[PDB]
Amino acid sequence: IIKTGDIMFAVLDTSVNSDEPGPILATIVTGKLKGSKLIGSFNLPSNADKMVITFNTMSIPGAEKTISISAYAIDPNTARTALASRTNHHYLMRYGSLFASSFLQGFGNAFQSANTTSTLENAVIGLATVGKAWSQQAQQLFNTPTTVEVYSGTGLGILFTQDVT
Amino acid sequence: IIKTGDIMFAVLDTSVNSDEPGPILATIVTGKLKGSKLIGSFNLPSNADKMVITFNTMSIPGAEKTISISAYAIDPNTARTALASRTNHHYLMRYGSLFASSFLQGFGNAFQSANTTSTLENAVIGLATVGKAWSQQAQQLFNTPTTVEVYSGTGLGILFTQDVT
Amino acid sequence: IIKTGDIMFAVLDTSVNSDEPGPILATIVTGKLKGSKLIGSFNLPSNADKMVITFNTMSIPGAEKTISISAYAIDPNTARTALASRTNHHYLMRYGSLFASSFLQGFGNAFQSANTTSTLENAVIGLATVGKAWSQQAQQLFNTPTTVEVYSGTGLGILFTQDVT
Amino acid sequence: VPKLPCRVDGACDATIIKMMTDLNKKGIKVASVGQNYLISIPASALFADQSPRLNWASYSLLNEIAAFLKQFRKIAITVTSYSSKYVSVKRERALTLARSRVVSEYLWSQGVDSRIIFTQGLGSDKPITSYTLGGDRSPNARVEITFRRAV
Amino acid sequence: DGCCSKMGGINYCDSSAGRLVCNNGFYSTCYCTRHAVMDLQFLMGCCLWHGGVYPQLNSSGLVVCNDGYVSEECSLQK
Amino acid sequence: KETALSVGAQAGLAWRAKIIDEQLNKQARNLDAIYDFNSLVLEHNILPPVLLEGRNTLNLADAQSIRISDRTYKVAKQAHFITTPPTWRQYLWMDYVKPEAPNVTLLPKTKAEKEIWCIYTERGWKNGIDQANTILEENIARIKEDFGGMILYRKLLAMNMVSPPYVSHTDLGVTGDGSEIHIDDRVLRITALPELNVNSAEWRAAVAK
Amino acid sequence: GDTGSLAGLQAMADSKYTRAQKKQKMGKIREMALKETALSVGAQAGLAWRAKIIDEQLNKQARNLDAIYDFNSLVLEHNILPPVLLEGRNTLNLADAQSIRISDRTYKVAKQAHFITTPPTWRQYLWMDYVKPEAPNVTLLPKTKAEKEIWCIYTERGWKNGIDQANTILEENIARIKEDFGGMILYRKLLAMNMVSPPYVSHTDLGVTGDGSEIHIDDRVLRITALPELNVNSAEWRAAVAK
């Protein structure tokens, strides 16, 4: 019997990027459960200010049993559900791509326009023409989110949801 | 037996941003119930002037029972329903992005137009052509709410709603 | 047994904003009921000229029951149904936002137009291009009314509606 | 602390030793061993000559000795009166008895705290000094108060 | 506030006497243990000198003692 | 408006009660001296009963119905055993718990409000004082009742109007099992509860000088 | 104020109390959480520390205690702990009204005697346990000087209370061992007085025994039958005197 929503401690070993869900295993190291482990998955939030881990398939040694307590994880010494990872992955790449494409468009077209008032014309050529398709593709790819990736050597605490027996 | 709507005091340990719903537990430190804990969740208001927490799943030691008294929180020492955090998280970034994109648009177009009466042309180029995509993306992202986050070391008071047995 | 619609006094200790309806409790201090408590919620009026509170969940000490007498409140020493708080929260903020955005639009466009009949051009640039987006956003946000918020240390008078046993 | 008395009311060992020193320098004998206190007072400084009467000025000394006694908890207090051989034995015994009764009465009247007050006088039945020249002036003409402070 | 004022100072606390002992050979006029002899003849307490305060709770102010007698002083008025 | 009256009455009751109780305690020894229970205890540690006396009574029921008597006596409380005499305290002492929480909700704001609040508190405190005094009166009446009843029992017994109580003691030697033993067991049991005797033929009168 | 009724009312007549009441209520809502934890931790620390110190002091002077509590000298002939007796004098009981029951002396058997193997040591009655605690679970903390000071003083009070509790437990154990020893010595005294039958034991013997695989030399069986008890014929009691 495990009290509804008590605290357990485990260590996470298998790291994975927040791109493809997969069975992630944690190892209970102390407390009543010794040598036990727990497989689960994650979710993806709309805003990447945090990252939570879903744990459902609990295995205990000793006997041939497979309980299914579903529980989440909390970061120790932060007392928050966020994950130790990075969130500035792909801001600058797309910002620079879009800005450069637009700048090329403008350079070609404006220097062509201001001809009234040869290598300069060739620069006009390159900028004005290659800007547009690059800019539209950059707008197409601009919506890709900045990912996060969990780490393979971070411990964790797990708050329970239901009881077991 | 608990009277309908009295006051109890507890401590909140696990903090969370007002971004992703998830289980949050508190521990009753006073009153008749001792060692008792409480799981619940939160909601999101239309305006960030306040924040409240939903608490429903009360776990009491002694017997393998799971009562479901639903209750909310009232801030001790303030007696107000708001949550102690920061609420000006995401005003300046969006304001600056919008204003800079607009300024670029205007500078490019007007200083190109005013040629009637090379580096100046290049500045016009950059401003005029990179203002537009940036401005439309800023209008796209401008409606991002400014978030709040509870604290991991703040106590709280709980007012009751119904009775128990 | 309480006469239909008689008068009682009570004290409000928990403050709340008129933004998220929720449980708010008060305590009867005089009359036949001593230490009795009262849970209820508020309503949002059509205009910010007043604010009233619904009181329905009455709990009498001693006995293990929760009657459902519904009643409202009046302002002590004023004999009014309004609320004692501030109501001028968000007039000038939206007025100034809208007026500044309009002034920017006008300055840019008109001072660009008046050229026929560099820093001046740049000011025209900024005004003409940052006025419009700010103006449409201000028109979007101008619908937010001025809210009221009760205090945590105000007493009250309560008129009854129906009888009890 | 405000509920349970931290110390016995109106007591101060510094005051106790101060008044003991003042009595000793005044010359009235004060002594104690273990938890038993004995105080001796010459008869001349208290009574008039060969009479069971109290000198008027002696009331201040009696007042302050009662004040000192008020700084103790006791049950039984014994007072004895000894004098010099003057005319007979019976007369001297009567004089000592009357003196003891008077002083005991005044002490009881004052705010002393006791359950038993014993008083007796003997006269010149047992001296405490071989020198026996003077009469009322002799130091053996004395009044003695004895008791035990318990707990 | 020195119990052994103008004396050697506190030595220890004799529990059988419930009293402090000064460094010089005397018992201080202060207590240390609650199991001593303190001469108090005045105190407080509702439902006093009866079965004590009955543990019941009443919607009104009516209060009773375990002997069954009531106390207006302990109760309120109306 | 009325919290003034309530708190005034409470404070007045508490203050008057504490003052009267401490004054009573200060004037101690004479009280126990006059209310000396033990010397009135009978031989067998039996609390004597209490007698109620009345003189020249008359009751009218209705027309042509009036019943008149000269004297009457009644047994209030039957005699019974006791292990220690009661004292003045169980009749005269009254409890005191000081209130300290005037609920600060209705507070003085304007001058006339302050004045009416002050005067209402004053009158309420006077009410509390007099109510405490009345309670003291009732206590005094009750204790006087009991003492007078005991005295009247003594006097009727002297006048040979009430049979004295009667008791029997039965003694047994060694008693118990191999595990529990008692040296001498004494069982005291009373039989004759004191009561009035209607036979006037044995009544005795006395005359002083 | 409340005690000096009129003075306190005229003091409340000013609005300074009417504004201080809110600023003190806002503190009175919350402060108890810190103080309860302070009392709990103070009690824990005081109990543990006082227990450890008293255990060390106890172990300091074991030898005299061992000498005084010689159960071995009290052991009977056949390695049997003597029984335990309790005696009360001047017993009185008011069962109800109209009837009372008294007696001079009464005697009760606490623990029936039985076989023993080792003389029980005082440690089984006196040795305090001791587990050092190393879990200060401090969740909430004071914020300003006032709450810090009240926290400190409440921890001190908790330490005091823990010391008191430990001392009381030690005293209770002392009382228990005292009454056990008193019961044994009382049994010895009464057996000298010739008022209690001595325990009676029989013994049986067999020589060699067993099968061809298991054998024993001398199977001796000792069985105690007549348990000690109080007699009822007081006439046989032999009196005692002194000089």
TrEMBL record, chains A, B, C:
Subcellular location: Membrane
Coiled coil: none
Family recorded in the similarity comment: Belongs to the TrbI/VirB10 family.
Name listed for the protein in its UniProt record: IcmE protein
Record organism: Legionella pneumophila
Gene behind this protein: icmE
Full protein stretch here: 862 to 1046 of 1048
Automatic annotation (TrEMBL), chain D:
Keyword Signal: no
Keyword Nucleotide-binding: no
This protein's UniProt keywords: Membrane
GO CC, one annotated term: membrane
Coiled coil spans: none
UniProt domain OmpA-like: residue ranges: 34-151
Protein name, entry field: LphA (DotK)
Protein's organism: Legionella pneumophila
Full-protein residues shown: 38 to 188 of 189
TrEMBL record, chain F:
Keywords in alphabetical order: Signal
Protein name, UniProt field: DotC
Full-length numbering of the shown residues: 60 to 268 of 303
